[PDB]
Amino acid sequence: STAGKVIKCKAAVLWEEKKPFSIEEVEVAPPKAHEVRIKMVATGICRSDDQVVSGTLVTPLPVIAGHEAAGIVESIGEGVTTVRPGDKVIPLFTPQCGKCRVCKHPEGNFCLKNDLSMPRGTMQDGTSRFTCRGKPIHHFLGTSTFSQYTVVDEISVAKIDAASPLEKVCLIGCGFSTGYGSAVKVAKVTQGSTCAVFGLGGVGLSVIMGCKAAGAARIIGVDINKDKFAKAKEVGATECVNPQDYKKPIQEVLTEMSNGGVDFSFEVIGRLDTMVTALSCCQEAYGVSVIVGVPPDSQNLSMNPMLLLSGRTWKGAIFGGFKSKDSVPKLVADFMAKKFALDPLITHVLPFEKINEGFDLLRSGESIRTILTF
C-alpha cells in the first residue's frame, strides 16, 4: 500500500539552534537499495538531542533529530536481508557494517561508516530522504527518530524480539546501553571495587546499574542537582555527593572518601572540567576513568600528564563499547528475561506532539527519560 511511495507524515524539524522543534508535515522518500523505512512507535529524549538544539553538538541544520527509539519496519529496499516488513527494530546511531577494520576488531565498535566524526546529516549515499516545505532536511546520526516515519541504512538497524515493549526498549537504542556498557564492557568494573559516577541522568543511572551488576562494593554518585540522589540510590548508588556542598574540589573529597582514590570513575555529564576531575579522583597507580559525556564542540581541555604517568588509564567510548547490531537484540533478550530494569529511567511519558514539553522537562532538571509515543 505505502511500499515504493512517498509518505507524508508529521516530524519534529529543527530549523535553527536554540529554537523549539516545529511539528509539521514532511515527505519521507521510499527506501533505496539496502535501506529500511520504519514506522516509529516510541522515542526517548536524550541530552545529546538537546546538545544539537544548544549547538554544543554540531550537525548540519535544518535536521530531524532523535536517535533513541524503536518502531516497526514499513518496507525494505532492494537487497535488504536482516529485517522484513512488520519486524520490531531499533535504529543504531552507531552503525555496524561488519566489513571495516573496526567492525572486525574484537574490542572496536566505532564503525568507520558512522556519521558522528564528520557529520554530513545524510544517508550512506550522501543524500536525504526528507523534504519539508519543498526543502531537503538533514538526517541525524543515520537515525532521525523524531518522525512518524524514518529511513535508515540497513547497517543502522537491528531486528529485535517480536514481543518486546517498544515504549521501554527504545532506551536500549541509546541511554541504557551507553551507561551499562560503559561500566561492564569499557571500564570492566570488578567485584568489590569503588566507583564514582559523575552525572545522574539516564546514562549515569545506567552506569550505576552496570557497576552494581559487576558487583562494585561502593558506587558514589556525583551531581550538583541533589533531586537526582534518591533514584541513584534506588538503582545501586551507596552514597551521593553534591560538589556545591564542599569547600574543597570534589576530586579531593572523592580521594579522601575512597582512602586514596577510586577504582573506576565515569564522566557522564559532558563538561571539560568534570572530565579532568573524574580522571584525578581515580587512584593514581591503577585507577581507570571513562569519558561518556559529550563535550562542547571544538573545545580542548587542559590537564597535567603526570596524572597518567603514575599509572592511571583514561578512555572514552560511544554506545557503551557495544558492537551495535550484534548487541542490541541480545540486550532486548536480556531485558525480556528481567536481567536489568528500564522503568527506573522512565520518569515521564508524552505523545510525540508534546516533544517541546519533553525537552522543557529535561532542561528543568525534572526528568530522567521522557518517552514520546507516536
Which spans of this chain sit near ligand CXF (rule: CB under 6 A)? Answer: 46, 48, 57, 67, 93, 116, 174, 294, 318
- Residue 225 binds which entry of Zn ion, ligand CXF, ligand NAI, none, with Cβ cut-offs from 5 to 8 Å by kind? ligand NAI
Based on the shown chain and the rule CB under 6 A, indicate whether residue 199 belongs to the binding site for ligand NAI: yes
Cα 320 from Cα 184, distance rounded (Å): 8
User: Among 82, 83, 116, 81, which Cα is nearest to 102's?
Assistant: 116
Pairing of strands 135-137, 130-132: antiparallel
Nearer to ligand CXF, 26 or 294 (CB): 294
CB within 8 A of 256, min separation 6: which ones? none
Based on the shown chain and the rule CB under 6 A, indicate whether residue 270 belongs to the binding site for ligand NAI: yes
How is residue 85 annotated by DSSP?
A: T
Q: Residues binding ligand NAI: what is the number (CB under 6 A)?
A: 31
Whether residue 312 contacts residue 279, with contact meaning beta carbons closer than 8 Å, is answered with yes
For the bound state, the minimum distance from the C-beta of residue 194 to ligand NAI, rounded and expressed in Å, comes to: 18
Based on the shown chain and the rule CB under 6 A, indicate whether residue 174 belongs to the binding site for ligand NAI: yes
Based on the shown chain and the rule CB under 6 A, indicate whether residue 279 belongs to the binding site for ligand NAI: no
Taking CB under 8 A as the criterion, the residue among 234, 285, 333, 365 binding its own copies is 285
Residue 203 marked in a binding site: yes
Q: What are phi and psi of 52, to 5 degrees?
A: -60, -50
Based on the shown chain and the rule CB under 8 A, indicate whether residue 55 belongs to the binding site for its own copies: no
Residue 71 marked in a binding site: no
Pairing of strands 218-222, 194-198: parallel
Residue 73 marked in a binding site: no
Based on the shown chain and the rule CB under 8 A, indicate whether residue 188 belongs to the binding site for its own copies: no
Residue 111 marked in a binding site: yes
Query: HSE of 329 in the Cβ direction (CA atoms, 13 Å)?
Result: 14
> How many CB atoms neighbour CB 290 within 10 A?
29
Q: How far is CA 180 from the centre of its chain?
A: 11
Nearer to its own copies, 5 or 105 (CB): 105
Nearer to Zn ion, 174 or 219 (CB): 174
Cell match 516530524: residue?
11
Cα 138 from Cα 288, distance rounded (Å): 38
For the bound state, the minimum distance from the C-beta of residue 51 to ligand NAI, rounded and expressed in Å, comes to: 5
- Give the residue numbers of the binding site for an alcohol: 48, 67
Residues in binding site for NAD(+): 48, 199-204, 223, 228, 292-294, 319, 369
Positions in the binding site for Zn ion (CB under 5 A):
46, 48, 97, 100, 103, 111, 174
